[PDB]
Swiss-Prot record, chains A, B:
Span within the parent record: 435 to 624 of 627
The protein's name in its UniProt record: DNA mismatch repair protein MutL
Disruption phenotype: Double mutS-mutL deletion strain have 40-60 times greater spontaneous mutation rate. Cells lacking this gene have an 80-fold increased spontaneous mutation frequency. A double mutS/mutL and a triple mutS/mutL/nth disruption have a 200 to 280-fold increased spontaneous mutation frequency.
Induction remark: Constitutively transcribed during vegetative growth, with a slight increase during stationary phase. Probably part of the mutS-mutL operon.
Job description of the protein: This protein is involved in the repair of mismatches in DNA. It is required for dam-dependent methyl-directed DNA mismatch repair. May act as a 'molecular matchmaker', a protein that promotes the formation of a stable complex between two or more DNA-binding proteins in an ATP-dependent manner without itself being part of a final effector complex. Overexpression of mutSL partially suppresses the high spontaneous mutation frequency of a ytkD/mutM/mutY triple disruption which lacks the system required to prevent damage by oxidized guanine (8-oxo-dGTP).
Family: Belongs to the DNA mismatch repair MutL/HexB family.
Organism of origin: Bacillus subtilis (strain 168)
Amino acid sequence: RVPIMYPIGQMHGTYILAQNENGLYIIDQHAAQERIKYEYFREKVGEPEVQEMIVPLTFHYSTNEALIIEQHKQELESVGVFLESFGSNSYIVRCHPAWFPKGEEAELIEEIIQQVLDSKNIDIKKLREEAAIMMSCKNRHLRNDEIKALLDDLRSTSDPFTCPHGRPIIIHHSTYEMEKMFK
Amino acid sequence: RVPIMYPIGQMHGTYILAQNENGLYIIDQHAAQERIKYEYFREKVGEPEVQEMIVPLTFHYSTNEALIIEQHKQELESVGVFLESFGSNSYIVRCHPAWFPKGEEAELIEEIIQQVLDSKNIDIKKLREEAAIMMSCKNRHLRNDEIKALLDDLRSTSDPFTCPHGRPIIIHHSTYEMEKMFK
């Protein structure tokens, strides 16, 4: 249960300022948005609403890369990458999950594959997390209502205080701690 | 020279939040108002625009107190207290500076005298300061324009960072220090 806090405003399009009877709260609005979008994609990944690609993809890899792909085919499908054999050392992608970020399916798909190739050996629990994060990443000044809605959405996440990378999202300065620094 | 900072808003009617390219600034709005009103009265005290009291005062002291008053008569006038002998161990106040806080001349005059009696021995440099402070003391939520005007007035004072008591007025968290706490 996260404490309800009311917007005071923002700054630099990066930091949100809010308050309640407990004192001041400062929030990294981009870190908060990433934690929120993460828990969305992290769930989508854990479960399949597939659609057809308007522009299907063809991938050409070295013999070694193609092999790593085969070793992770099931893990790749888990995160929505459906590679179809297209000869030796080549694959086609004709479909993908409907919940993929529109207009960015191609770049993401290639980026997810690249993470597997880069790793050479990667576990499904790790891939799911890494993939969900790549989906979360895909300086806007917010009104106070936008901030209220953002903070509400954040309060409902399973981990409101930490971002998917371990960075703190919400800093708090109580009534006391503030009086302290002014005395 | 104090850096220009733009209002973000306030909270609890006690703390003001502002920012510029350097980062976040937090200001104790009551401490800032006191520093501003102080430098006003501190100057008024250093120099005489006298008016007549609508309701003149009569003071009755013990023999001892009356004596301390006589020893500080000149120091008292310096801060706008003009005690006129009214028999043994008694004084009248028929006038006072025009710049005295309207409607509160009587309470202030008595409070200034009381400070002299309490001290028994007090220097003019100290009395001037103590008196100016009592004049400065004589939870309102501010709009952003009110805050801008307040911060401007503060920026022009000789000591914008410290209140007449030595308490910090403006806390600052730079871009770096903020990124730090979020990493």
